[model samples]
Target chain A: MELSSLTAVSPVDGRYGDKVSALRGIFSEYGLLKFRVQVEVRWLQKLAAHLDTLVANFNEEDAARIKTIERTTNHDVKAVEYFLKEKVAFIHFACTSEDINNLSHALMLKTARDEVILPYWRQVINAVKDLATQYRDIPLLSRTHGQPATPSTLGKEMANVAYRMERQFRQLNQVEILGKINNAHIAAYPEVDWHQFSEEFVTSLGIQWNPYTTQIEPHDYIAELFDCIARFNTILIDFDRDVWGYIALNHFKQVNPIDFENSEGNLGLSNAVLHHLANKLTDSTVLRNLGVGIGYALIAYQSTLKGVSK
Target chain B: MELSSLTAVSPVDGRYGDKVSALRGIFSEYGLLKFRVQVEVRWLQKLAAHLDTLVANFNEEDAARIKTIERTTNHDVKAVEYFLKEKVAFIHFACTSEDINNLSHALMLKTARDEVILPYWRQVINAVKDLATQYRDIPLLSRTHGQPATPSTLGKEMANVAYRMERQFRQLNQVEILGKINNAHIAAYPEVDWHQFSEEFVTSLGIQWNPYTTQIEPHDYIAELFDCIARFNTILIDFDRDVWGYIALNHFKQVNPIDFENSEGNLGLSNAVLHHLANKLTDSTVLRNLGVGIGYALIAYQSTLKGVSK
Candidate 1:
């Protein structure tokens, strides 16, 4: 699709319109802005509700006004900050953008994963497990060198994949997520939400967080997660081929042509390319993980020399 | 990583090993068998010029004796086929196992890609070329989100990647370049030794009959290809973060730091990653393209798989 021809210009908006809309909310510019604002608002609310440090004047009505500013600005963080500036009703204050972005992004990930990716992933997982168990015992001839070699029960093979995939999924689950908050005041800085803000804040929001973090996450978890996914993808490519091989061997029969067609094209030769794809995915994923394995997937440079330090 | 310790092992060697190792030639159980026979024969020849296959008759030498059995069993393929079948010469047939494997795999990819993928990809080329060139100019303020956005000149962003990838290198000039072959199946598959082969046999191999193939072609082309190098691993993450920024920005400055040791303990951030890795490696690349945004950053996967026939 011509990016310019559509109402949505980016490929995400145009070519992969529906596929990317959800991403817009998570990774989109507007999405980040909103999350920033939400974090700020929540921070303000938290202060008003607890902390005892703010001036006694803060209250629910003021909180509503803060939300109003968020609505008016159409930018979340800016709105929250504006509300705070007005609420102080005094001289000025010191806060860095990192205070908002750090907490917000962590919160964003928590919400997106728990509320979004994970729930969807769970369905996919359950579906695969169900399939694995269903197909567990049927033995099938295994091909070595693309020429038949030995036999493997289909269930055992499925179990093999199921086992590896389960580990990867669990590994993803084990990441110690972190978000650093350079709160507005130097005083609040002392109370910063450095690591461990995960479960603490997330649970308050009725969500959960990774137990540990640096200024930002180390991202090793995500990298490993994708790596595992890549492995899973390649293995599936193998299974798909094995199944396809059976069909070819049996004169191309299909118990469910619609299901097969919807999921894959001619199953015969795809195994070759699929193998390539799996390897391609694995290599990319490994690089991706390695990139973040060194940390600092992002840095907040709000000003020339004034960025917050992790 | 001990495989035994891990609960899940992605069958890189398990289910898929047989399929994948074919490309490598000397990496599997089958490879061991095939390689051993080739070595046994080659070692004797290295001892003397035992031109077993080329000569009309054999003088019942040890190598010839080994071969007599190889010819009688009619199972050179099976000789090595049974790795435990320890007879000295009863081995992989038809030149070498690598010759067999290399030829088979090359055939596999050739048929698969031609009959499948590229047909779907042709549409991409048929579309106007300028669309790609247009987005090349749009400046994106790159960010690690919490950090300052880097000033990466667009065009070069795309070019930065497009220019130096290892995948493209495989497809470029010399790769698809033609060669020769004659008689004796000399022009068989695209072998690993293009440099040493005569123009006749060399010319007889592959999709284009570009060069002769043996059991192995080094596939260094695939290994070093720009396409394979273009891991979209972190590209999507980077793009997602940049687009989420509501404002404009550019340029990256190193974060010189006292690393705030996260849970993993004092792992340094920033430059520990390959910030200079791109410039460090040399390829069929020139210096003019660095950050010029010759094109947009690749979406990673879409470039190679653009065609959907498969």
Candidate 2:
């Protein structure tokens, strides 16, 4: 099937494609394959220099050759393995598909969040903070339970959003992105301290190292990050609703950057995607089918980044 | 419109009617109305005997008369309040609709769990435990990623389910069924120590009291219980799938209580219901409209109980 914006079922492509086009190179099928190739090449280079001597100079040229071979094989990790075998007979050593794939998936998420989502989120915060200071004395009637009750300054209301968003953002940053590299069949490897080796390799890529796993990394950290984002989106939605309610009641005039429609709809979509993405990595079913779950995560992140931009 | 198995939209009342019949007295529309009446009357009786001298002789006959008035008003809580005004002018006395509604919901969930769902769940546990002991030595091959990996005894597999279920069950029991009565917005009354009085009243009905709240008791504990039930259903789904897979592979012959199809489908429906129900009591939106969310929780519990029975 020829994939394009018109062919996409989800609005993430058809309606919001351009908004999230920035995510294509990092969260697309080609991106997944590219990351797999990078993982394999990284492993190959490390082995050639430290562990094995067969490919004494495994270079970017060989990595490029492996990418070329993937078109025929059509199996990403398999293609990388096959290409690597020609250069060094025991290329993967005792590593499973998970050992390569998990690290790459984390790398993709870490990059997307740091580069795309956070930058856009900061812009949103800046705008809200600007309004917070500007409307310091503007009084807002704080209604609870549909009853005329307490009243607070509108600046405090806007400031509440900026503050809560920052709190959740700090929490998002604290989430350590974890990855695991397991040997085939959860089996023990030679006494070369495989755990130490795998941990070092994973941490070297700036992700936290999980000491153990089955064939796949347990995605608890991914769930934590997703939840943090979900909370952020939830707070965004909370503030959006309050502001829109105020606008409707004529307490706040609909002015520049007061695009409540976009803010509400986009955050709603973003939160829903984040909630679903939370399940992607945490499910043990990931071991049975990595591709399906990974596909969901990529789409969800793309939708989330797009929503934030809007 | 007379309600019956034939007229029900959800299978909880149609195909699964008999299985969930145990929940009819508590989770139905009539049941919610009944609980609301109970709360209103309980308050009325308390006021008549202790707070107010106007209706010091209040009795069940008066409560019955209150139920009759509900048909005219077509509002359960309002009908009860109107009924009380003739005998005691200050019946609800500084209470919001949530004050009554939140307590009654906790009452309903606690009763459903203790009386209906738990009894049914215990029956399930016993049957599964019987099988666990019966097939103590039947060997089964454990597969991973469609590959033959480890071997385990059939009894051990069943034992694992029982062990995990018992742990979850114990955790479910640990969840303190919570309710709240706010003192602000809906302020307190005479020096009879209303907080202590209401807590005593709530606990007398077999649930815990939440001293802190806004208008409605935030349904965090309801979410906690729903999540507990969700986890229980999840564990149920997990074992059901495993057994179905084993049955498909001919590891176990189709015999007594070998109803994997029913188990899988029922648990799926059950889990979905529980998921929706968790939002019912918990959403702050309920302050605006209780009917919609309460409708979801009632059916979810009924479906959940039925699934366990199956």
Candidate 3:
């Protein structure tokens, strides 16, 4: 809650923080920490549920204690680990740090999709759809080389972007989200790497095991998802800028701010953030992606498009 | 000087007037106006220099008067047309709006580079070099998949970005700066073309006789420049985010009160405003490239080197 910079804060945080706070819960450091904690906690609970009777060490009582650790550790993922060890005595089970780590991350991201991100995205998507339908008929001049060239419906313009966005969303929805419990010993033994134990165990936990994994998950899904998510916003930036120009020419009246979205270029909102997001989202496939995925989006050009084209 | 958005507004006028004041002299609507004026004046002057004599109706007085129109028109290329129509009594001999527009833009951009942008860029580069060298020995955790993977020296990291940036600067520097004058027949001809001119007249003006021109001078070079420029910044945004994370983790410091030469991204003088520059640079090309020789740069990240040691 109390985020302050050590030096002159980034203009994004220091100068524009006022305009950016609403985004913080989803793209700020604290937001990332909270999501990491949520994911870790859920994974531990689910794991414990699997070992109900004589599961020996971890029990319902231990689960209660794990929840307490979040308050003490302040880092959700770390809290889960620390909580696990505290009851390490009661649990007859043994798992590596990566088992918890990978599962925690997978769960955390899953939670973000189900909880924090999807709801707002649905709201925004519906809004865009409405606009596309409404604008699909109004004709406007298309500037080729800053000279008037062709004509297209304003509605068609929105429709074009909407279709592009839908493709991005579909790509995201289809990308296989897979991971595992980081059980390397099972593979080494070749015996425990059986389909029933490895696949079934993870399926019980609601994840598809990437049977071939190093100490960590390959993160291919996240990377794919990042690209998929970023394209939606990036294309919107192109549309947003064209709309801003249209407004200047009296072809459109930009919707006034319910909130100011992006402000980084000479023209319209520079798609810079979205551009970075596209690059970062897919390749930033590390534990750190966990950090940025929740916190800052590339640049929210969607809002700008809505604001400018309104 | 007193630019309040309430009195006169746009985001540029309102939220970022002071932020981009430096660019007023080089790239605003007013700046575009002056560029038009300069082309008009220069074309007339070029004709005079070629004819070794002023038109029978005009004298040096007319040249001086046209030069003065630069302040009033504020658009160099436009001033060229306006000035000729008013003074030369004979003009636009063989030109299309594209001829005037393309040459004037190149002139404005080239002149700005020589007089303003490149000079300031060198200063920023020096500032960054000082950091890269100073922290050359400093190694920090490198992120892949948003997870910490390896160690990278701050110097190498900054150097990586510098190299990318230098590529763009070199491209921008090498881009052909072109202009034309005294070719009146081409303007009103059945087809707008630049090839009708013999090599001598075209080459004399630093332009190759580009036979494949529509109504405008093909902006292949500008297109080339922008794609490279976009890449330069895209690569830098990767560096920018890394450096930003470093600053967040107490690794380096951002030098502020930084006049951004053309003040980009709010960075409050922290995050490399390089993203903002690339964002704006693309605007002109996006508006023009379809007809020009500027080849499309389908830029995308193809891979994430999991074991990219060093």
Candidate 4:
């Protein structure tokens, strides 16, 4: 059955589906199949060339064809292998599924972080910073124990949130998107130093090459990325509630506070899912859930932007 | 109408429900209601006496009566107020719902940590330590990148997991269960020092008093507790997978590896939920989800114990 927004199980793909359409091309089944094809083609291109056409011409039709193949083969990666088999027999030669999968997942996260998450985070930080500067002189009756006790500017509170958010942003950006492929090729090509070759191939994909691993990359970096993101969301949650409190106290009389409430709810949901994703990446089987957390985060980031704009 | 194991949405409460029955009394709706009654009675006793009989005689029938009141009041805490009105008019006087809630949550968590989680963790740790001692001199083939590389004792590997688990256990034990109540009573009792009184009241309940707060305790301590648990679970995850690898390589011929697989899956699920619970504690409304994560952790802890036994 086709999953329309109404039929989708998770609210990320259901109630808030339209809000996160930008992520569909990066996180959905089609998105994963697309990256899988790209990784296979790229690996093939590294071994030889002219397979760039296979990658360049790839589309929803190509991914759909791969899914058709998957139905018979009952293996997603092997289906990608069969899809590219007409052009060359060595399509996925000397590689395990992890060899392709680790790189594909890395590309997905790297692209999403670079293209989507960071930009939205910057906008949020900027929005808060703008408020900080604009409201620099606006006096806020500071409450201790919900009773006015001291005086402070609204700007300082906004600045505090921005500063905390910026720290998390820096940490998120610093986290290396690591990838790995095992050394089974040692037997296939006895003379070649497959370790050096693997390093070159992985680094060329713009991911940090992890030299030590089992069949999978172990995903310590994913935990690092999600942890930083969760921290950022936590600060946003704090900021949202503070603004809600300000509105309740009649500090801000005109603005609708629902955006802040919505943002806080989504942020909590995002951190909840991301926390799971970060802690659950012990094996490759659980890697299928990579996008679930990020999707929630995107919803939150969008809502936060809307709240800030208001 | 009733949530039986078959109808419960989460596997922690549904498919694996019986396995975690111990938690039903600690992390369930019943558990929360029971603790709320306890907090109310204890607070009343703190102000005076004779309420010890109310707590000592409390049972499920009493809790069911409270729920009956909640249906009409539409406020869980207010329902408790009406239930206790026969005894005293000042049952919940000068108290916001959060004042009762934060203490109830603290008691629930403190009891869960001390009575259930810590005991299970200690058993898992001891089992691994036993393995470390028993297999101390047994030589094993160690693999790096799926190739036999060096010689190491199986006991040493067990020791490493035990060591990592120990560190997290120590950290989890140190997390303070913090509680808070606001100062609206300042107007009612102008002569009494409420801050000192509140501190004594909260401390008497065995929870650390958080003097500084808004209407609710910020729940930073919950985050600390879950983070430590997640780290412990992560190490256990590594141990489970490594043992699975060992079984595949024909290391332990007598033992079934299914327990380890189950443990890994539940641990991942636990961490995922715990991560969410930890990060979502920014608001009091979200506090209703406190048990959702702990249930998953208890299931994982039980699975780990089974795996260790095998």
Candidate 5:
């Protein structure tokens, strides 16, 4: 079937595609191939010599060509190697697919976090903060067990969410994007400082270097990052429900309640997907869904922003 | 669509429908209506009392009749009220939809836990224990970071999983299924002692009574239940990956690797959905998905059993 929003299997790509379009370039199949090419090019440069041009001037056609090659090779990373073979004789020399793929995945997350996720998270947190300030003095009756118990301001509740979100935000920012190389083919170049080289290469990619690993990066850092994000989403869900309750009480006379509900639903989905991704990251096959969770979170963040704006 | 396995939206009900068929009578739309009927009938019995026959003789046709009524009422709980309005005058006396709904959901979980989930979990744990015994004394080289680090027995690794699964099994067994009645319309019958009645009614249904709540149960217990289940699934995923790695190491002339992979994937999906369900339980709308996560877990559990058998 021809791929379009209408025919997409996941709602993330179908009904809510536009909401998460910013992630298309960072988390799509094309994006994975692009990162693979960059890693290979950078590795080749580190070993011998404008294959920098391959990294610097890469575009959609280059990525598409790699995909075309992938059909023949039946391996994604190998396709990138074949695409670059004509220009560089020793493309992806002595490196396993995991070595290159781990770095690429890390770069994908790093770019997404820096450019898209963090900004959206900030927007949401600030939106909640705005609610805190805008309604700072609006006194309301607070219920302890669904019965009127004490007096409180509407802004205090919003402030509670903002504070909780800020803590997770800080933790997410601090979660190191980790990567590793398995130190393969060290026998071929016995004189080279392969350990130092691995560390330097990984660090050069702006990823934290894990000196020890099997074929894969262990993915514990990913679990940590996702756990932090899920926590943030959980707090957001709580805020969504509280606001929804307030609306039911005729507190705001709020279009906004449904937005909170939508945000609440999508945030739940995002956390669910993230929980799976974090828990199942031991296998490489599960990595294909890395974007799915983040897409849900982005959709939720946008909905929350809309809710706050209204 | 005709609602066949072929056209089901979720893989838990679609591609893997047969794998989770046990859940059809417990988690499906038909299942929800059935439980709703049971709760409403039991409530009527408590109020005055053959409404017991309504629950005891309940079947798909009864559930279908309620669905037909729902087509006009556009409210599920209300439809149940209308379905029983003929047999008893005070069908849902002093009750809100949330009151009936919360208890029904708790009962559904209680039944599923007792009848389906815990049994499957024991099957998986026992399968692992059997491996532990059968493989006992078989020494294997253990790797720390994908490299030989220490010598260990093959059975010891299997034992590790069994022990971990056992802890979660115990915890899962202990999680209290909680429910609440919001004490609606209590003023109409001031002399009835509704507090003791609420506690007795909830306890009689095999659910823990919460004296405090709004229109719905807080669902912290559901989160506790799912967290324990997800933790169990996480350990299973870890075991699945370990076995896959050992297979790659040529440890067992193992149909089993793909089983492990399937189990891993489904477990991930299960935890993801559970994470959402647990986090988003603050809203009543999200409760419709109470079975989706459990369905995924059931599929994974069955897959693990198949893998262990091989």
Candidate 6:
């Protein structure tokens, strides 16, 4: 019973899944569960070395136990936490579910952005740059509020988008995508000036530390990141509509898939979904919110990449 | 030197001045300065009562000194902070600028929402509910995908908006408006659990405590709240478009001033600005971003309330 493109419900999985197959290793359900397990294992290992309470270290048999627990409990982080409790005996003394969930989620997101999304965006930028330079002086009619106005070169218009997109991409990279791994103080961990030590643990994992949290990381960075992506999509949509209008008015021929109207339509849909996902991620109340939210973003990301690839 | 409606540049201050006049007292430059002063005074008072280092209590002479300092410094929070430093000797010893700025900002926002925005929204909801009940039995032709398909009561259509708006309003109210009054460290004031003391101070101010922060509250609650308002605006837009189509098909006459198409236009503009503000509030890097962000929301809020009043 293998899932295939033909039998898939959404086009991102059904038809265009192959185009975004690289994301499957990170954005899939198995991927999420796998990341959760990895995070819990790492946390246990860290706690065993750092904390005096944790007397045992994690081993290979513990991984198998976690998988079996995950299947039985039907909760990813819970199963991992429970498995760690049994394996290390005293790990997660004061930590909550979100303490691990947030770190693992951030790690997965950073990796996805760097390994998959950013690379795709860089390729798109390079392609746009080529067009911008290739038509550096090609004159064209431009519109002011959808009316005849100043005449500018096609390269100037494309270059405007290139510059704007680059700025947005830079801002996205600088979002300080933060995470946290502290007890919400619902436990026996005493106040011992642990901020420095806790921060070191978070920073050691290559993510910024969010000192304050509820039972969860709060996902403010996720909100900012998705909002950044949504804004980037909006700029691309603006470029698409402008270029589409140009072609419709005979300023440019229907010569390149790079500036097709259909791509704009796809980007528009993706931007809308991204906005919805950002809102959802910011105000998440339930764990199911993650499943639904990430699923939506994954689909939206797939479509957006498809449009950009075209 | 008076900056009155007569000399105002925006219509929210000029032509629509009367309709939005209530907002002026809250959103004006003077209003912002006043809020900053209040936050500074409260912070110093709390430190004197709670913190072991601050042995001196605040008095009227200290207040006069702050006013004298404020005029000379010409910087709101900085002036207040400097005044506190001189008055209490260690008022801001371990605090960042945001330690008071976030709490003060939240207090202003809470006051504005309770006093101005919520009152206006309730008025709109009441007006819509009245229309809903009044037209409960009035039958009308309903449009189905552009062609007349079924007949429906005008009440049901009005009820749709009332229900949707009520839901969105409830969501906006439930947005967990949070505040913070400490730097990220908990050990700076070890004589007492300053984090708990700070938490109590913030909660007693009638807002939720954020507990953990970098230098400021991070403004995630602001982002969520603004995003909520933007969404509420979107629901109104949907209602506006639906009724506009009905009017174009001669479904009803120019009924009440409550649902003017022009009002819908104002809400749309405000919503766009709110989205922009939410983004700014989320990834705040500079003091100027706040200086610019809330002013933007202030103007937008004024225009939005003006439209509703009309």
Best by DockQ: 2
Model 5: residue A188 alpha-carbon error in angstroms: 38
Q: Residue B44 error for model 3, in Å? A: 45
TM of chain B, each: 0.30, 0.71, 0.55, 0.84, 0.85, 0.70
lDDT, candidate 6, B155-226, per-residue tens: 667776666566557756665667765345534455766676677778777887754332324345555566
Q: For every model in order, what is the number of clashing pairs?
A: 60, 0, 55, 2, 1, 1
Can you tell me which runs of candidate 4 are displaced by over 4 Å? A1-11, A14-19, A49-51, A74-77, A87-96, A143-150, A183-191, A212-216, A251-254, A281-285, B1-229, B237-310
Encode model 4's per-residue lDDT on B210-267: one tens digit a residue: 5433332544557657776787888888888877776777753537788788888888
Task: Tell me which of candidates 5 and 6 scores higher on TM-score.
Answer: 5
Ranking by lDDT: 4, 5, 6, 2, 3, 1
DockQ of each: 0.02, 0.08, 0.02, 0.07, 0.07, 0.02
Residue B8 lDDT in model 2? 72
CAPRI-wise, candidate 6 is: incorrect
Query: Top model by lDDT, which number?
Result: 4
Q: Which 10 consecutive positions of candidate 1 chain A have the poorest summed lDDT?
A: A296-305
Model 3 chain B: weakest 10-residue lDDT segment is B295-304
- Across A76-184, the per-residue lDDT of candidate 2 in tens digits comes to 3367666656665342453345557677777777776787667756766776777668878987765645755456787767776776577656756666676766534
Candidate 5 CAPRI assessment class: incorrect
**Candidate numbers, best TM-score first, in rank order:** 2, 4, 5, 6, 3, 1
- Over B1-310, each residue of candidate 5 has an lDDT whose tens digit, in order, gives 1232222224554445565766656666566667877876677666552236768786666666765667677443366667777445442444456676778888988998888878988998898988889888977775546687778888888898999999998999799888766544545556666766777788889888775554546556788989999999999999888777767677545333777887888787878788767865235435545676787788778877888766
Backbone clash total, candidate 2: 0
Per-residue lDDT value at A132 in model 6: 69
Tens-place lDDT digits, model 4, residues A1-310: 6887888899888988886877877777778777877876687555542237767776778777776767777543356666677546443454345566778888988988888789878988998888788878877765646665356788876886786677667767776677766654535445656676678778888888855332334445566577667778888888888777777877535477887888888877887777766665225455667677788877777777787665
Better of 1 and 3 by TM-score: 3
lDDT of each: 0.35, 0.56, 0.44, 0.72, 0.71, 0.57
